[PDB]
Design a binder for this molecule. Structure first.
Ligand SMILES: COc1cc(C(=O)[O-])ccc1O
Length: 164
């Protein structure tokens, strides 16, 4: 499917916000979303669709403990690019429960990036953000809420990104 997404799922946690210079953290603990942030850096952001669709509990083992137990979840894997080069790998797990009312948009993203700057129709909350890493790269997972309805976001920062 994609080597970056394979790395992403290998991320390992122990939270601990990386003592590394507080300029790497401001990225890793960033609360506004990646896209606009990547754009500020002066570059066209674009989405590469790897796989989107409903999956059962046994296809989301790393996320399951952080979400409620439902019949299926909407899984979306994408790669995010800056002026053509991959800067990040993204994997979203959305309990079917969350896809109620205006949240059915989470299913119609296409090659359009996820949340906020159009999600000025809803109102998000953020339970947390914990840093992870593996094979030398940074990654973070966060549980977001739209009207209280949870979804899990995990990202991996790739070598070409404005972190390392
Ligand atoms: C998981 O994080 C990301 C996901 C997506 C997406 O699915 O379109 C876009 C940007 C991200 O930072």
């Amino acid at each position: 499917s994609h080597p970056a997404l394979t790395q992403l799922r290998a991320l390992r946690y122990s939270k601990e916000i990386p003592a590394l210079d507080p300029q790497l953290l401001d990225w890793l603990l960033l609360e506004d979303s990646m896209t606009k942030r990547f754009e500020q850096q002066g570059k066209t952001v674009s989405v590469t669709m790897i796989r989107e669709g409903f999956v059962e509990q046994n296809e989301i083992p790393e996320e399951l403990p952080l979400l409620p137990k439902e019949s299926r979840y909407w899984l979306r894997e994408i790669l995010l690019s800056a002026d053509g080069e991959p800067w990040l790998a993204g994997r979203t797990v959305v309990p079917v429960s969350t896809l109620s009312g205006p949240e059915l948009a989470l299913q119609k993203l296409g090659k359009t990036p996820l949340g906020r700057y159009l999600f000025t129709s809803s109102t998000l909350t953020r339970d947390f953000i914990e840093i992870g890493r593996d094979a030398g790269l940074w990654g973070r997972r966060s549980r977001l809420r739209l009207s209280g309805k949870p979804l899990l976001l995990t990202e991996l920062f790739l070598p070409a990104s404005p972190l390392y």
